[PDB]
Every structure is written in structure tokens, then in C-alpha cells.
């Protein structure tokens, strides 16, 4: 339980670090596929079976398939991306990096001063999530379907060839 969680977290952080510091869109997309697999391994270590299963079903199975589809649309062969590599110049990235660094310091200082007795890792089955989803969270289900409908119709209206 501990080994899988820590290994998946380590390769997760390494993977997303390789995503944000890469120039090839397909290579970064593959790296974040690996990262999402790692987040789902973290979820399975924590006992959230439905959450990690769903991360590989749609988060690592549907949305980024559309991402690769758009990369296939554009055929990004490195035009106006790698010819300057301006995001690797230290005068560009050092400032925002120290911004996110002091933000991370503040966030982990807030996290480290809270109670904790550990996570027992008892599995939460998909039937309990289904019971709660169509129990006290029914408005969330229907209005999230409405949200998906709104995203669908706007993406249709904008993404047209004509």
C-alpha cells in the first residue's frame, strides 16, 4: 500500500515535471499519460477504486485522446515553438518558478499543521459511490449533465469548419 503510493507519486511528479519542460507536444502528452496512470495508481493505493478506474477510463482515456487528436489536427512540427525555446531562458521562468515555490512553501506549511491519524486504505466500492451519487447528490448529477450539455453545444458552435 505504501510502496505503490510513494512510487506512483514520485513518478507522477517526475512525469509532470517532464511535461511542463518539454517542446514536443506528443512527447509531453505521453508523459502526462504516464502521470495520469500514476495518479490512478495513487488512487488505487488509497482505496478509491472508482476514482482511479475512472481516471484511466476518461481522464487518461477520453480527454487526452482529444488532445492527441488536436495535435494531429494542427500537425505541430515545431513551428514557433522550438525555434526560440524562450521558456527555457532563466530570465523567463525563474520568476514564476520562485512564485510557485513560495506558494508551495505556504501551502505545505498550512498542510503540515493539521491533524492526521493516517489513511487506513479500506476500499470504497463503486456501489457505494453509485448509492450516494443518486441519493443526496441528485441535483449535482442532473446539473452536471446540464454542464456537459453546455460544453457540448458551445464546442459545436465554435469548432466548425464552414
Amino acid at each position: 500500500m505504501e510502496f505503490a503510493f510513494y512510487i506512483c507519486g514520485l513518478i507522477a511528479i517526475l512525469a509532470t515535471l517532464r511535461v511542463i519542460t518539454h517542446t514536443n507536444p506528443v512527447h509531453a502528452l505521453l508523459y502526462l499519460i504516464i502521470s495520469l496512470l500514476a495518479i490512478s495508481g495513487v488512487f488505487f493505493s488509497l482505496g478509491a477504486y472508482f476514482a482511479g478506474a475512472l481516471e484511466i477510463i476518461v481522464y487518461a482515456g477520453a480527454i487526452m485522446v482529444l488532445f492527441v487528436f488536436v495535435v494531429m489536427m494542427l500537425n505541430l512540427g515545431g513551428s514557433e515553438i522550438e525555434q526560440e525555446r524562450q521558456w527555457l531562458k532563466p530570465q523567463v521562468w525563474i520568476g514564476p518558478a520562485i512564485l510557485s515555490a513560495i506558494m508551495l512553501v505556504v501551502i505545505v506549511y498550512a498542510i503540515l499543521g493539521v491533524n492526521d491519524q493516517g489513511i487506513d486504505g479500506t476500499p470504497i466500492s463503486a456501489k457505494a459511490v453509485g448509492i450516494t451519487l443518486f441519493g443526496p447528490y441528485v441535483l449535482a448529477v442532473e446539473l452536471a449533465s446540464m454542464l456537459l450539455l453546455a460544453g457540448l453545444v458551445v464546442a459545436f458552435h465554435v469548432g466548425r469548419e464552414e
Binding site: 506528443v26 477520453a62 485522446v65 495535435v71
Partner: protein
């Protein structure tokens, strides 16, 4: 020496035996593809390499091992090497949750068929990566067409599964195969039967949905740049996927290993092999539809059919439970 370690080693040995049997019957299903097309086309097929052609598959394995393995210089190396790996391992791991016999299962997961669904997602990743990595606009458009096809059928694959999920009441394979102890699931989930059959055929790159044989004349197949053992990896992955979808179908809709008189593994093998022969019949018989027709049948027909099937299944289940 300890009985717990003995049981662990026996379970590991059973899993390894199952995996080796699956890959060997995938290669033997390549050989059975050739032989059964020969039988169905009023011929014999390969029958001179060994007795009855049984040593032909060794010759293809030797040839594709000792053929030159070549990665194009203009192609990206890592994605080119990676795509057949995914196309093999995704459907292999999709097999990995099938209960063949009582006491003979690799992983009695609480999810199962969900893990099959995410391996199908990995399969669409495999075809997308194989298409993009070749650096060829013919393979680019061909694999885009194939990937859109398999998306348009993987959208309702899970919803066709959901009828059997509703009847079983859980996600585990053992509960699914034990809910068919009285009546086989092919009878109530007949719409689930046809929709899952169509989705499994389309998602596994099989006729009449196989893109590299859909348009050979445009020279736009995404396998066109793949040669050597990568090509054999692609076909072994496709045939292993045929075996995987057949075993999934047997354990889902046809009662799995349950049988009146024969041992359960014999019944499982017979039902799987019957569905493999059904694959041969639909490959050799069914003509290939046009691409927009495939889009229309995937979206405007099959998905509402799965939704209505799930609604009717829920109404019947709650109505019967007073």
C-alpha cells in the same frame, strides 16, 4: 517450506500457465485464421509445413524474428517502438481478468470490466501513436479515420456492458458468472448481446472495421511503415484481442464455464472457440460498409439502443424486485 508460500507459488504458476496458453492460442489463432478461411473458401489453407500445417506458425515466427527490424530516420523512434507494445499489452491485460475455471483466475478484481474498458482506451492510444509516429500523411489520415471509428464504438461499448452490470448487480466477474447459473445472459440482454458484439468487433480492428484492409488502394494504412517483429506484434495483438473479446463474451453473456455435464473448462473452451469461428464467419461473409455509414450506425443507432436497453433492464429489475 510453508503452505502459504506454496499457495502463492501455485497461484503464480497458474497465472503464468494461463498467460502462456493465451499467447500460444493467439498465434494458433493466426494459424486458425488461415486454416478456417481456407475451410470456408472451399480450399485447404496451409497444410504442408508439418502435419496439416501445424508447423507453419513456427515458420512465420522464425521469419519475423530474423527479418530486419527497421525504424525510419524521419520517424520518431520512441513512439514507433511503443505503439505495438500497447496494442499487444492492452488486450492481453483485458484478458487478464477473465475467470476461465473455478479456482483458475488471475485477478478477482472488484472492477474487472472497467479495467477491460481502460485497456480499450489504451488500444485507441496504440493506434493513434502508430499513426502519428510514422511521419506519413497517408498513415496520418488512415489512423485518424480508424481512431475516430473506434471512439465512435467505444462510446457505447460500456453502455452495452451496463445491462449485464445491472442484471449482475456488481462489477466482479465471479458474480457475473454466478448470476447466469440459472438462465444465460444472452437471452435477456439480447440488445446488449448485439451491441457488445458490434463494439467488440469494431474496437479490435476486425473486419468489417479493419482500417488497413478497408482502403488498400489509397495506400493510407497506418501499418504501411511497420515491418519486422513490430508487424507481427500488431497481428499477435489483434488475434489475442479476438481471444480476449471472445472470452469476455463467454464470461459475460453465455454463462462462462457453467455447463451441465462436461468439465467447466471444456465448456468455456467450446464456447470461446465457437465465438472465434463466429469471428471467422463474420470476417469472410460481411462486406465492409462506408465510413459515414459506420459513423451513423455507431452514433444514431447503437448508442440509443444501449440507453433504451439499460432503461428497460432497470425497469424490469426493479419491477421484479417487489
Amino acid at each position: 517450506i510453508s503452505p502459504e508460500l506454496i499457495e502463492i507459488l501455485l497461484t503464480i504458476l497458474k497465472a503464468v500457465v494461463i498467460l502462456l496458453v493465451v499467447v500460444t492460442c493467439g498465434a494458433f489463432m493466426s494459424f486458425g485464421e488461415r486454416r478456417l478461411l481456407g475451410l470456408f473458401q472451399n480450399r485447404y489453407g496451409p497444410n504442408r509445413v508439418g502435419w496439416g500445417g501445424s508447423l507453419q506458425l513456427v515458420a512465420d515466427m522464425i521469419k519475423m524474428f530474423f527479418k530486419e527490424d527497421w525504424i525510419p530516420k524521419f520517424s520518431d523512434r520512441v513512439i514507433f517502438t511503443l505503439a505495438p507494445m500497447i496494442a499487444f499489452t492492452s488486450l492481453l491485460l483485458a484478458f487478464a481478468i477473465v475467470p476461465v475455471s473455478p479456482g483458475w483466475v488471475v485477478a478477482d478484481l472488484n472492477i474487472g470490466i472497467l479495467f477491460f474498458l481502460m485497456m480499450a482506451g489504451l488500444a485507441v492510444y496504440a493506434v493513434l501513436f502508430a499513426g502519428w509516429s510514422s511521419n506519413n500523411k497517408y498513415s496520418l489520415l488512415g489512423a485518424m479515420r480508424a481512431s475516430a471509428q473506434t471512439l465512435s464504438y467505444e462510446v457505447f461499448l460500456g453502455l452495452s456492458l451496463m445491462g449485464v452490470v445491472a442484471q449482475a448487480g456488481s462489477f466482479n466477474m465471479t458474480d457475473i458468472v454466478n448470476s447466469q447459473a440459472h438462465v444465460w445472459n444472452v437471452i435477456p440482454q439480447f440488445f446488449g448481446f448485439i451491441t457488445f458484439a458490434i463494439a467488440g468487433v469494431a474496437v479490435c480492428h476486425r473486419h468489417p472495421f479493419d482500417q488497413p484492409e478497408a482502403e488498400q488502394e489509397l495506400a493510407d494504412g497506418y501499418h504501411i511503415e511497420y515491418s519486422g517483429m513490430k508487424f507481427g506484434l500488431f497481428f499477435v495483438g489483434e488475434y489475442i484481442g479476438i481471444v480476449t473479446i471472445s472470452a469476455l463474451m463467454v464470461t459475460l453473456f453465455f454463462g462462462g464455464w457453467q455447463g451441465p455435464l462436461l468439465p467447466p473448462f471444456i465448456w468455456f473452451a467450446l464456447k470461446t472457440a465457437f465465438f472465434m469461428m463466429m469471428f471467422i464467419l463474420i470476417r469472410a461473409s460481411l462486406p465492409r460498409p462506408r465510413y459515414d455509414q459506420v459513423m451513423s450506425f455507431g452514433w444514431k443507432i447503437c448508442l440509443p439502443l444501449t440507453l433504451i436497453n439499460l432503461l428497460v433492464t432497470a425497469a424490469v429489475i426493479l419491477w421484479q424486485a417487489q
